[model samples]
Target chain A: DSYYQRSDWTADEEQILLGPFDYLESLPGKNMRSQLIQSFNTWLKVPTESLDVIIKVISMLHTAYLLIDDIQDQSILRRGQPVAHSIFGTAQAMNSGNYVYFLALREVQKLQNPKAISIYVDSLIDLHRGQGMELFWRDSLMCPTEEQYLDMVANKTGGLFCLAIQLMQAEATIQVDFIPLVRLLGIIFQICDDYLNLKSTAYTDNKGLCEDLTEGKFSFPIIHSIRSNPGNRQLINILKQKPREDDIKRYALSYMESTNSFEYTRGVVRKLKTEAIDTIQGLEKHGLEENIGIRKILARMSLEL
Target chain B: DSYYQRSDWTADEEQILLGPFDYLESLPGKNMRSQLIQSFNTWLKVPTESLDVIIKVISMLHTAYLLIDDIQDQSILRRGQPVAHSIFGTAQAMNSGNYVYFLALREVQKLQNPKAISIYVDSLIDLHRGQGMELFWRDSLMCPTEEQYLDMVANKTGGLFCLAIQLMQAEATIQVDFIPLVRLLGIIFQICDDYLNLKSTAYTDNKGLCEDLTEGKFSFPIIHSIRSNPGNRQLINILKQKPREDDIKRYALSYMESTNSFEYTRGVVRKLKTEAIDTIQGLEKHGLEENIGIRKILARMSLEL
Candidate 1:
């Protein structure tokens, strides 16, 4: 396998970091390499692979979660292919996931950077909490409405994002201030992810038009729709009930779009995105020039290239 | 659920702990609770309420594991009832198990004592590691002999047990000198667990005798039995073969039981148990008098009572 295929990385990018290849191979497939490498590169503002090992560790652990998660979700596909559990059977998939976690722990502990270690620990804890939160959502339908969903994403989803970035930023003496900003970027990225899942044309794991209301997931669009549909209590009920009938989905989607609920949600996402950018903007003010510049270019590529 | 039933508890034993009602609402009924609580009160010398909470957490988590585990094992029965995954389906069961982990973490973090909190974190990490280790073994299948099994038990099975007991010892200025000792006791207890599953008349959640072996677990008996078998090479190969059948199991059991491997294994357990006791004995000679006496009675009650 080419180095980039192992990760969605260029040879130039791989050469920048010392152990990028080993880190990339630690995960299940190319998805992690792509998502994680991009996340780390943009957040740390470094095209170099300094955080390669740490990203690899997190990606490996994240893959472990995904293996179990696919079983829990009964998800048929992952990364455009059958889930590990689906292909290998649940037991072997589970065993493989655990092996991945063990390997990840070993890999993460090797970073030997205290600040990196701290942020990594924080991310791991957040991931653990996120797993719990997901379970909470699954067992009881009483999980907070879409608004509360954001918090869940922060704890479960955004937390890992922040962890990857904060860790890569660990060695800086004057870069102490970048931490909070990177944390918010995690929030922005997660919000965007949820948005993409709902409306993007890319490989949406949940399939096209993956509205929270349909999946009964408390995503921004569903929450926005719920609040905006106050005039139609029956519509509210249908949305809350998570109706499967074509008519119900049509009605809900229409009302959501008609009332500009998606637009409203997008506005909120934009605000968070700006906040994320603002967080990056403060880097030079705090003397994180080289790191900030790299991060800036990475962010630009995200919106443009 | 009844108040006490809804509450997690072990069976009561005369004056010190609750008896048969312990596993009332638990997944495995009473037997598992009896074993667990017996281990807890004896090994940790903690209060009944604390024991109840921990046991409840364990039972719930174990039950969750069984649900997901059954799906992995493709075993049909759990607690003599259809496995949760088998009944409600895999997704629900996986979510249920994940919820168990979630609830346990949330409960542990909520505890008042900082020392206990730290110990709980260690246990949490171990729980993750232990599960990971089991998965690691399953995939590798380079099953260790009984001696190696003990090391695995110390890391996999005993990790949580020791962490729990050590936390209790860390009260105020207790200094947690018993961590390593409790770790050994945990391994001993796990050995007994395997033995009980094989020989005891206790009720179980899964299919009959040597469920661990049936599941291809690197159980202590399996390791020792195969090693001591007269036809060692053939027996090992038979046991190692995929799609294990009755003849293989029967031969293994015959060697295990006939070679007095069962008793030999028990002797090892007794030695470990005695060492576990002596560990407290050492503590008695060294630690606070109040703690020592309680610890002695605690260790004594498990085996002697």
Candidate 2:
């Protein structure tokens, strides 16, 4: 029975042996949960501490919605294992997502800052727009050109990126031109997401490589490839097919790669990254560039572009 | 070249053939385009004189978002046709939907009626919540009980119903309680929808007949059946299975019919209709119910209930 129990609580035998939480020991999923918990912490860096709660909570709630969204997207592996809906079933997962969102929205408005409230409300609308964009494209055929694809991704993925920054800037008294910079950062982040969806299976969405093309998604790579190859009408046919399997995916990857579509996409990503950075530089007069923390996060986040 | 006509006279005839603004009148898809234009006219029952161009435009935009929604829900028919996304590809439909939403928001807020702006923002959030609830349910198996189901439907579908009513009601300084009454009417509409979705073959979804039961949906009729027949554990298990096109639906309908589920459900609907009428009664005290047009619309909408 001498399992090195703390002398202070050893007398209470059974209660003391309740494991993890009973002891002062770290919980099993502490690290991963903490990483998620910190997703909103960066927003707390803004000057208005009173408004921090609302912004941070809204960010958290948005993350929670993404969890349910991954399920709706039929994504299998999220963070490391089966997504919430997959593991817990859709109903519970859906409720959990809603629960989190409600909590988040409540926290955001608790600041009693009317301007901030309005901006976040707009952000909510933008989030819905992004969702509507993604849902619309799910069963669609008319994939746009690479540039248009970039814009869609920016709206679909970078929406939150824009909102987070916008919420932060809403706290300031200066009527600075912040929208364009936030928008650029949003586009940059979305391009990164596209890259992650395509190439970095190891990093995010471990459902293996080229799932986007398999889903017949109109990402930057596929659009660029199609635009570059004039005679590749058959490639478009391939992209139009439904429920793509591994063999079909192999064919598409080969077709796109052989035509230098992937390379073209990467070049476009570089150009976009440069453009976003330039836009941020243009905001230097607003002193936003001097926000070292935001800069660091943006640098890390813009890995794709 | 005609035998009796000179070349100069023929040139003058060309003016009759093609007038100065002839190209404008012959613009493509003129008829369908007008349907697209008049889509928002459904909500124009509100005071037309008070509405600025922006408000009118935004209302039209909201209708567009609903059309896109029908498409995402895989509805084959909307406004008595294939949904916009179904008729016109998802990409175009989605873009149009986004256009409408932005247009509506801009139109409403552009002129800066502070009180109206606040009301519109609140309604917008409520709309999001309503949509969120529906989206949440579509993915979940944790079917709410009949009471909860009705409440959920009210929250999701009735949200927009109440919103539109509230928007119209803004023409007068209406009682605050009328807002909730409007919400109740919305719930009644949803209850009717659930019933219709069950009763009619025209509205059959991928989920088969008595599909709610087979799909473990927690609607009122199903909940009542389950409560009334506690010993049908075996039937309940079968109902929980995701039903096929024929087998699950037939079995569910047969089971419910034998159990008098329909009769019970009708009784519930009758009670709800009473509540709805009672809710409408309060508006009479506010002196707005005396409007014959409003009463006629109410009677017509509640005809089935």
Backbone clash pairs for candidate 1 read A45-A294, A45-A295, B11-B18, B11-B19, B12-B17, B12-B18, B12-B19, B79-B205
CAPRI band for model 2: incorrect
Predicted candidate 1 versus true structure: per-residue lDDT over B194-262, tens digit per residue: 776666545333465455655666667766766664333333433344323343344446556866767
User: What tens-digit string does per-residue lDDT give for candidate 2 at A10-75?
Assistant: 534433222211111211221322232233234334565754574466446555665667666666
Give the distance in Å from residue A122's predicted Cα in candidate 2 to where it truly belongs.
1.7
lDDT of the structure predicted as candidate 2: 0.54
Candidate 1 wrong stretches, greater than 4 Å: A1-50, A114-119, A143-147, A172-174, A204-215, A230-252, A290-305, B1-305
User: DockQ for all models, in order?
Assistant: 0.01, 0.01
Question: Residue-wise lDDT of candidate 2 within B1-305, one digit each (tens)?
Answer: 76786445586664443331122223232132223223223323334544444446444544665555655565544534345556556675666665556656676664445665666667667666755665565456343466666666665543355444455456434434455655665565556555555666544632234444434445556656666765443234334454443433554565567778778877766776677566655656655434454345445554554
The C-alpha TM-scores of every prediction are 0.40, 0.42
Candidate 1 Cα deviation (angstroms), residue B268: 59
User: Clashes per prediction?
Assistant: 8, 4
TM-score of 2: 0.42
What is the DockQ score, from 0 to 1, of model 2?
0.01
Q: Which candidate is the best by lDDT?
A: 1
